[PDB]
Amino acid sequence: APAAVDWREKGAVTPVKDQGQCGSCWAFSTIGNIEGQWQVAGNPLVSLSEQMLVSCDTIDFGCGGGLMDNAFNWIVNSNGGNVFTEASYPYVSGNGEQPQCQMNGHEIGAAITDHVDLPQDEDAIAAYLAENGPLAIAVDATSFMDYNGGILTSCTSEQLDHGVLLVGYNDASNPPYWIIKNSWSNMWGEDGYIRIEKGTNQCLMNQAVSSAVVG
Numbered sequence: 001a002p003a004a005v006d007w008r009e010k011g012a013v014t015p016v017k018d019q020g021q022c023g024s025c026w027a028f029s030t031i032g033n034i035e036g037q038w039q040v041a042g043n044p045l046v047s048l049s050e051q052m053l054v055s056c057d058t059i060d061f062g063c064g065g066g067l068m069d070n071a072f073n074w075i076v077n078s079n080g081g082n083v084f085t086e087a088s089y090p091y092v093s094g095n096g097e098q099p100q101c102q103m104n105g106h107e108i109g110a111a112i113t114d115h116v117d118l119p120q121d122e123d124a125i126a127a128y129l130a131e132n133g134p135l136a137i138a139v140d141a142t143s144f145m146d147y148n149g150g151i152l153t154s155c156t157s158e159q160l161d162h163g164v165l166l167v168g169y170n171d172a173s174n175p176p177y178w179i180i181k182n183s184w185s186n187m188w189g190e191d192g193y194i195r196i197e198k199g200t201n202q203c204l205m206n207q208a209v210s211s212a213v214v215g
């Protein structure tokens, strides 16, 4: 793969969001992925709606939790592949309140046809990322809690508990690192982002990597 990829610079990554007091990281990971895949497939970058998943996805458990694979499954099999725009269906569950699913009054911003699950292989991940755009990944986010900045090189890697967005990497660095977009606002980490070492399966980052398919 290329020595370095940063999908932010290429316009496939929206501003950092904030899930708030709701267990919806799974929806933010899924949407960030679809946002990146939709742009890189050749369409204008558009912000898409986590609230659609929080309120309408019947496979997952709204603010109680969920899985990116199940979110992809719901979008394709229950919503005809369609993803509503962030603007037309704003995120209101940041206080943990969960309105009922609202199917009316929105604009469709993107569409997906399937999803893939990537092998548990950092090189396989980097190539698919470099080709297709940002990727949905799960991490053990234990070491995320005290992170101010820098590259994590001894990330607690015991148990997966948090969905994030993989937007890039940089091998021409010492250590080399992945770039991750978190959903804890831009006042956490490196303006919303975190760097973790690439090649040592930091935070169990290789274990559950997925992506929507566009087109």
Ligand SMILES: N#CC1(NC(=O)[C@@H]2Cc3ccc(c(Cl)c3)OC/C=C/COc3ccccc3C(=O)N2)CC1
Binding pocket: 022, 023, 024, 025, 026, 063, 064, 065, 066, 067, 068, 137, 138, 139, 160, 161, 162, 163, 208
């Ligand atoms: N934010 C947030 C919260 N965490 C999640 O939504 C995680 C977010 C999450 C955690 C771990 C993950 C993934 Cl892919 C997501 O990968 C391994 C999967 C473990 C089992 O995850 C679940 C399976 C079924 C239903 C929910 C989960 C789950 O625990 N999802 C606390 C609710």
